[PDB]
Design a protein around this ligand. Structure first.
Ligand code: HEM
Length: 154
């Protein structure tokens, strides 16, 4: 699949706003994932013991977690499809270390879109959301291809 430069533009334009506060978007996102899909939390040995959102909110390890995710993702989008290199190490830990099924990747893509829709209504109309979805789906499709090569699901 291939995004046009116009789609990249839309993506990168909302991303510039997320980057005004990485930590906070980082929190909203993981908390969204964990509330919608409680099972994903079990994957996180360092977070499984958090019972409530309030606790999620106060956890400094979660906030750090979110910045890492967003910074890794950001570094991938800014590549505009040329992200082979960046993806390798990321697919290897997720498939062989963490053991994250593609399905959980879908869940987070969902939470990312949800949060950008609440926080940047003016920068995240129908077109911009269509463009981020396409960018996230390209992300997943490639990570899925790498998984397969590393000997996981596929
Ligand atoms: C946008 C998609 C994702 C990005 C860019 C991302 C990125 C990262 C990065 C950069 C790290 C640190 C180094 C590493 O192990 O590779 C990490 C760790 C981790 N990720 Fe992800 N991740 C994503 C999705 C997921 C999902 C959806 C889950 C679980 C449902 C998850 C589970 C984990 C786990 C369990 C660790 C280890 C945490 C720790 O103990 O330090 N990842 N991820």
């Amino acid at each position: 699949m291939v995004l046009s430069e116009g789609e990249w533009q839309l993506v990168l334009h909302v991303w510039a706003k997320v980057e005004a506060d990485v930590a906070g978007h980082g929190q909203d996102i993981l908390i969204r994932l964990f509330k919608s899909h409680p099972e994903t939390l079990e994957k996180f040995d360092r977070f499984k013991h958090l019972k409530t959102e309030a606790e999620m909110k106060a956890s400094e390890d979660l906030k750090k977690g979110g910045v890492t995710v967003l910074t890794a993702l950001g570094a991938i989008l800014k590549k505009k499809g040329h992200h082979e290199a960046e993806l390798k190490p990321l697919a290897q830990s997720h498939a062989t270390k963490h053991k994250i099924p593609i399905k959980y990747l879908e869940f987070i893509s969902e939470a990312i879109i949800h949060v950008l829709h609440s926080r940047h209504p003016g920068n995240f109309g129908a077109d911009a959301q269509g463009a981020m979805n396409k960018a996230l789906e390209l992300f997943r499709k490639d990570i899925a291809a790498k998984y397969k090569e590393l000997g996981y699901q596929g």
